[PDB]
Amino acid sequence: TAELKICRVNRNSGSCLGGDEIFLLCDKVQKEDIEVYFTGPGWEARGSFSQADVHRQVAIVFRTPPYADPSLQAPVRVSMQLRRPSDRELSEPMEFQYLPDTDDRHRIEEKR
Amino acid sequence: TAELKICRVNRNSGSCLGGDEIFLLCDKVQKEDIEVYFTGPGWEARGSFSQADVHRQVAIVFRTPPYADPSLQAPVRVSMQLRRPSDRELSEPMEFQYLPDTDDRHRIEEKRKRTYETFKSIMKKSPFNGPTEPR
Amino acid sequence: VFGYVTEDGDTALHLAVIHQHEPFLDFLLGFSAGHEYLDLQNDLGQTALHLAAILGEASTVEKLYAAGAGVLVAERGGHTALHLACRVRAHTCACVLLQPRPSHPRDADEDWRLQLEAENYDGHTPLHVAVIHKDAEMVRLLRDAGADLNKPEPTCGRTPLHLAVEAQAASVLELLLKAGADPTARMYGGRTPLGSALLRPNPILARLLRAHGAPEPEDG
Question: At what angle do helices C58-66 and C22-32 cross, to 10 degrees?
């Protein structure tokens, strides 16, 4: 069976609020049997995308999920990896850094 | 030479200074025979990348070229399309918009001018007197 | 303590450096020293130090540093003052920062090395930036400072050597090589610096890697 592997991403950091579009290049996958699994100490979540979002089975465009803590005050490093519901296989993890929300959040909360 | 088609891009705008990395998803291409051709009235340029930047011949990661005018003062729409040096074939064009650049050192300079009067004032009101009286 | 701020979030300090007014700067620092006032960030997330670094003013960076300005604070792009220096070739500024803070301000975790591996939001440490910008002089300062020459950036695991190859900066590639950067490192895909250099135009790069014991690439 093909192995799961993330070859490259356009960015490795984003808002703790989630919603950041990520372009991910990988080895051959099956569009109906693949997901982007985010994990950290006591936290799990998946990227958001549809099958139409899997390009020639070698690329995926997805939006990052919101982090556990929306009022993050400092960058938090988590893991990003490909997951196959099929056999529960996982690719080698890739670092992803969640960042605090700029303005409005914490800004109106004793900062500004 | 089946077909040339840009299916998706991560962004359609960038600094007029060039240098923005673009992730471009397309139909099958040949890494040694493909380029990203930028065009506008009286202007052409190519995206910057190497054969190693083409992924499974269905995606390309490249940096945008600098636009003709570095001191752009308003958004300029141009066309972006795949080009095959082989038979000079071109894909349908995709719009791309160059924008005025937000350079650090220059951003500081315009901020300096915009704040001249304010600065003169703050130190005027402060207990601070002024530079040494030149003999 | 003074607390004026412009519409851009710039305090009297930010404006002292923006206006390059050493005399007033000295005045401000006269009190600021040790306070949190020094690390206040305008709306771009920049502190006075960041501004001084961008301007490439080694003398101004020392005053701020001597006064106790935070050296790990990051602006909007996650850039520390050292990161900014590496973008504008501010060699002398990097030098001021790359050593123990000056003793006492100016009256007529305290490991400065934590700056070396600080990473911005692009997943870049200062060395990555110096190489991306083909800055041999800056690479030298970072090397001597003890920066990690093998640190992979996170989009696809490129090491400093991979970046130098992408940058087609042969002299930088060599500096890295002579300093012992492991030419056997592969990015997430598996490609090595040599394998990468082969798909590049400038022949020098491949020659260097070869000359420094870089194993030959594995097909494709």
Answer: 10
Residue A75 DSSP one-character state: -
CA dihedral A89, A94, A97, A98 (to 10 degrees): -20
Cβ pairs A/B, distance under 8 A? 38
* Contacts with A55 from chain B: Cβ below 8 Å: 7-8, 25, 58-59
For chain A, give the number of residues.
112
Best of C8, C10, C19 to disrupt the B interface by mutation (most B CBs within 10 Å)? Answer: C19
Place of tokens 């005045």: C27
**Secondary structure E strands in A41-75:** 43-46, 54-55, 59-63
DSSP state of C188: T
**Cα dist from B37 to A72, B78, B80, B117, C37, whole Å:** 42, 11, 6, 47, 49
DSSP string, chain B: -----EEEES-SEEETT---EEEEEES---TTS-EEEEEETTEEEE-B--GGGB-TTSEEEEEPPPPS-TT--S-EEEEEEEEETTTTEE---EEEEEE----HHHHHHHHHHHTHHHHHHHHHHSS---S----
Expt. technique: X-ray
**d(Cα C19, Cα C38) in Å, to the nearest integer?**
17
Report the run of H or E that residue A81 belongs to, with start and end: strand A76-84
Scan for tokens 């945008």, then name that residue.
Answer: B64
Query: Domains in chain A, start-ordered, CATH in brackets?
Result: 1-112 (2.60.40.10)
Closest CA to A112 of B110, C9, C200: C9
* CA nearest to C29 within chain B: B128
CB-based contact (8 Å) between C77 and chain A?
no
Domain spanning C1-220 has what CATH number? 1.25.40.20
Task: For chain A, state the CA radius of gyration.
Answer: 15
Neighbours of chain C (3+ CB pairs under 8 A): A, B
Calpha distance C130→C121 (Å, rounded) = 16
- Compute the residue count for chain C: 220
Resolution in A: 2.0
Q: What angle do CA B38, A52, A14 make, to 5 degrees?
A: 70
What is the distance in angstroms between the Cα of B6 and the nearest Cα belonging to chain A? Answer: 12
Among A10, A22, A29, A54, the residue to mutate for chain B (most B Cβ within 10 A): A10
Say whether residue A12 is in contact with chain C using an 8 A CB cutoff: yes
- CA distances from residue C51 to A30, B119, C84, C122, C130 in whole angstroms, order as listed: 49, 16, 9, 20, 18
